[PDB]
């Protein structure tokens, strides 16, 4: 359920507005026919790895910038 | 000039003005100062506590030298802190007697070994005539064996109970020390959970349900805060389900069962329990009473180091002794075949000959003889003479004399030789590091020789290993309200096991000019 | 009288405490087997000249222990080489074990521990000699700076161990102070004499030497 899940995601502890955003990322079929596989699609990970590489790259190559830390 | 006038005061507090270094908040190395109880600058001196540290450095230099070297150290401190908590501790007559016995436990068990010599010296006089004991010295001495046998059994029983009040709380401590930490960090009972194997950990599932769980760790807070750190992760009250005269019923059951369940696992109690059961068997017959002379293997450090050598490399060894069994089985298969005729035990002639025609006994023939003979197998067999197999039988005998006695026994005798060169070099590296690298900062001697004398001061006036314990005495024995800001930084990080505060690289000299 | 043998027997006493304790242990394990032997396997023991009349079963256990030491420690084959050989008894299944456990646990280990303790004594005494020479090759005995600082100059460190501290000259200087009038001292020598009286021993260079002090 869309409302019950908001209380259920505090177990996993992502913020609830964000959880509603995840439920929107889900097709949210019928009242709340939210398939778990329609949530594996977020694929996007290439970019997260690249962002990690970039932020790590800066963290290593430009140390002692408080803004960056 | 002002301070030389002050010397009178500094000389008095010098013994117990302990001090250490920390990498405290500001990243620069602060040098905090802290009171040391004069009892603390004493208890850490005379006893096992000095040798226990010597076991420690040997248990790090030979095993650690890595990220755990700053973490096992406190793991040595929290144990050692607990030891003095014991000594501070050391029906009203009962505890007064029980403490009397627990403090005497090394002298007291040394008396037990003394009775083990005294009785067996009297066992020596036995002979069959019906077993019998001649008593040329007197007449009442045989009852003295009846009296010493009780007196030993008395010591055999009252030693374990003092062990129960001495080492055991420590053994129950460090078990809980290794548990309470894992609930608060690794989260394994809250998550990972050990499976079948590492059953010692699986046995530990039983204690955590208990309210009286953190009994020896001086932290009742443990379980209360595990749920704070882990209950938000997936479930609150479910973790609380995982946690939380009238004296007859007052004791908890599953804790105490777990406590004896850890105590049985301890080798030291299982040995003393084994040391005692035979003493109960020593009444039931005196020759079962002689097993106690094996205590000298544990009863003196001198022999223990020698016998330790044999088990130091013994896993390699027992496989080799077992390999010996197998290489002998290969000859006995070659012997049961081909050279079968040669085997004999022909008393007068033919009638009572004992050819080893059953290989199961033929295999037994070589181990009882060829492994033993020292001459090899051919020394106790019919000597070949005129047979075509004679050329071959020699090849069976030479190879067996080489491969078994000149090699495998040579390895077995020989693996013991290297065990003294491994155990020695381990003793060397301990000293070799201490003469060079500081145990803590890791800077090593050579930086600190630049100043006069030097490095010996850095190992005393500075880090001196010990004071980090006294400071951990000082923190645990101090109100949480009462901390100074440097100390609170330590104690806060100390709770988190971040362990940054131990100096690493930098010391107070490295930081400055 | 000769240092040569003296080093060898000193090798022996170098680890000889552990050794005597190992022999004592040997006695104790042989006592344990003599106690297992005085029971159970008691019948096997014999010294039956012709038959029965002059048999010498070691029925007094003291003589039995004396038997395993005079014979079983020595036999080289273990205890079973000089006893009636089992051949029919059910104890024969056990007796071999009593042999095999004994032959391993005395002659194949304990004697091995002994000889090996001699071995580790030679390697230990040699390793000590090696540490002496090595500490002489590197660190100066006095200042402690070590060879490597002093190789920066040509040749070097051998000079620092001769032309400089050379160990001995501190002794000649301690001759020179003791063999010199207290009135006659120079301020340097008076200083060293005074501190020498007070056993403060700061005057020995430590770290710094004349080269460390200067450029
Ligand atoms: Zn240090
Ligand atoms: Zn020098």
Curated annotation (Swiss-Prot), chain C:
Impact of altering residue 79 to T?
A: Loss of channel activation by halothane and caffeine due to Ca(2+) store depletion, probably due to constant Ca(2+) leakage through the mutant channel
Query: For the motif Selectivity filter, what are the positions?
Result: 76-82
- Identify residues that carry Phosphoserine: 48
Please list the tissues where expression of this protein has been recorded.
Answer: Detected in skeletal muscle (at protein level). Fast- or slow-twitch skeletal muscle.
Maturation and modification: The N-terminus is blocked. Channel activity is modulated by phosphorylation.
Question: Per the record, what about its domains?
Answer: The calcium release channel activity resides in the C-terminal region while the remaining part of the protein constitutes the 'foot' structure spanning the junctional gap between the sarcoplasmic reticulum (SR) and the T-tubule. Pore opening is mediated via the cytoplasmic calcium-binding domains that mediate a small rotation of the channel-forming transmembrane regions that then leads to channel opening.
What family, per the record?
Belongs to the ryanodine receptor (TC 1.A.3.1) family. RYR1 subfamily.
Provide the protein name.
Ryanodine receptor 1
């Amino acid at each position: 359920s869309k409302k019950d899940f908001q209380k259920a995601m505090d177990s996993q502890q992502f913020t609830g507005p964000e959880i509603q955003f995840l439920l929107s990322c889900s097709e949210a079929d019928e009242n709340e026919m939210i398939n778990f596989e329609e949530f594996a699609n977020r694929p996007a990970r290439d970019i997260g790895f690249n962002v990690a590489v970039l932020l790590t790259n800066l963290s290593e190559h430009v140390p002692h910038d408080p803004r960056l830390r | 000039n002002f301070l030389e006038l002050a010397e009178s005061i500094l000389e008095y507090f010098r013994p117990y003005l302990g001090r250490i270094e920390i990498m405290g908040a500001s990243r620069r190395i602060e040098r905090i100062y802290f009171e040391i109880s004069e009892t603390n600058r004493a208890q850490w001196e005379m006893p096992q506590v000095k040798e226990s540290k010597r076991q420690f450095i040997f248990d790090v230099v030979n095993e650690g030298g890595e990220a755990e070297k700053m973490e096992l150290f406190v793991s040595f401190c929290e144990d050692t802190i607990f030891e003095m908590q014991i000594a501070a501790q050391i029906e009203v007559q009962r505890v007064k007697f029980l403490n009397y016995l627990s403090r005497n436990f090394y002298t007291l068990r040394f008396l037990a070994l003394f009775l083990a010599f005294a009785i067996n010296f009297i066992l020596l006089f036995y002979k069959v005539s019906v077993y019998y004991f001649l008593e040329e010295s007197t007449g009442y001495m045989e009852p003295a064996l009846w009296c010493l046998s009780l007196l030993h059994t008395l010591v055999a029983f009252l030693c374990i109970i003092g062990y129960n009040c001495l080492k055991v709380p420590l053994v129950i401590f460090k078990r809980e020390k290794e548990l309470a930490r894992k609930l608060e960090f690794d989260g394994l009972y809250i998550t990972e959970q050990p499976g079948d194997d590492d059953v010692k950990g699986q046995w530990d599932r039983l204690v955590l349900n208990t309210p009286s769980f953190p009994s020896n760790y001086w932290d009742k807070f443990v379980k209360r805060k595990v749920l704070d750190k882990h209950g938000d992760i997936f479930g609150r009250e479910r973790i609380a389900e995982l946690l939380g005269l009238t004296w007859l019923m007052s004791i908890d059951v599953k804790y105490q069962i777990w406590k004896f369940g850890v105590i049985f696992t301890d080798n030291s109690f299982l040995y003393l329990g084994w040391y005692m059961v035979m003493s109960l068997l020593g009444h039931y017959n005196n020759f079962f009473f002689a097993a106690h002379l094996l205590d000298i293997a544990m009863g003196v450090k001198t022999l223990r180091t020698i016998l330790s050598s044999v088990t130091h490399n013994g896993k390699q060894l027992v496989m080799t002794v077992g390999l010996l069994a197998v290489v002998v089985y290969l000859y006995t298969v070659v012997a049961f075949n081909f050279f079968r005729k040669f085997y004999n035990k022909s008393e007068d002639e033919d009638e009572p000959d004992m050819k080893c025609d059953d290989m199961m006994t033929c295999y037994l023939f070589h181990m009882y003889v060829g492994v033993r003979a020292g001459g090899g197998i051919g020394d106790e067999i019919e000597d070949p003479a005129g047979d075509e197999y004679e050329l071959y039988r020699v090849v069976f005998d030479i190879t067996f004399f080489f491969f078994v006695i000149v090699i495998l026994l040579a390895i077995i005798q020989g693996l013991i030789i290297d065990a003294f060169g491994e155990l020695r070099d381990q003793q060397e590296q301990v000293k070799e590091d201490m003469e060079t690298k500081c145990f803590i900062c890791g800077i090593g001697s050579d930086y600190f020789d630049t100043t006069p004398h030097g490095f010996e001061t850095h190992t005393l006036e500075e880090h001196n290993l010990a004071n980090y314990m006294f400071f951990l005495m000082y923190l645990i024995n101090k109100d949480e309200t009462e901390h100074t800001g440097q100390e609170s930084y330590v104690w806060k990080m100390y709770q988190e096991r971040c362990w940054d505060f131990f100096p690493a690289g930098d010391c107070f000299r490295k930081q400055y000019e």
